């Protein structure tokens, strides 16, 4: 079986810091499966970080960046889309279990 937990969070950081996560991902012909529901995912998240306090964890997959779907969007364009918002980031992720 699969347990898919969708969670939508708003990340608010200061100028002198980061969101506190490492985005990893990726070709491009992508078929979302329950195990891999997206391409880009959080490889690590800094404990007590902005992202971390927001609820986000290692393994979460990035579905949306600021209301816009990034399910099939490349790594470059996603990092690029994250920077676009500056200190505010609304992100929609999925935590896949079992």
């Amino acid at each position: 079986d699969y347990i898919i937990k969708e969670k939508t969070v708003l990340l608010q950081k200061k100028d002198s810091e980061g969101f506190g996560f490492v985005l990893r991902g990726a070709i491009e012909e992508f078929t979302p499966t329950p195990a891999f529901p997206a391409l880009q995912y959080l490889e690590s998240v800094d404990e007590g970080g902005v992202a971390w306090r927001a609820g986000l964890r290692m393994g979460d997959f990035l579905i949306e960046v600021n209301g816009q779907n990034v399910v099939k969007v490349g790594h470059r364009q996603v990092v690029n889309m994250i920077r676009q918002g500056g200190n505010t980031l609304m992100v929609k992720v999925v935590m896949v279990t079992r």
Binding site: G18, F19, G20, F21, V22, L23, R24, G25, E43, I82
Partner: peptide, 5 residues
Amino acid sequence: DETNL
């Protein structure tokens, strides 16, 4: 490929 955010 990775990025620190």
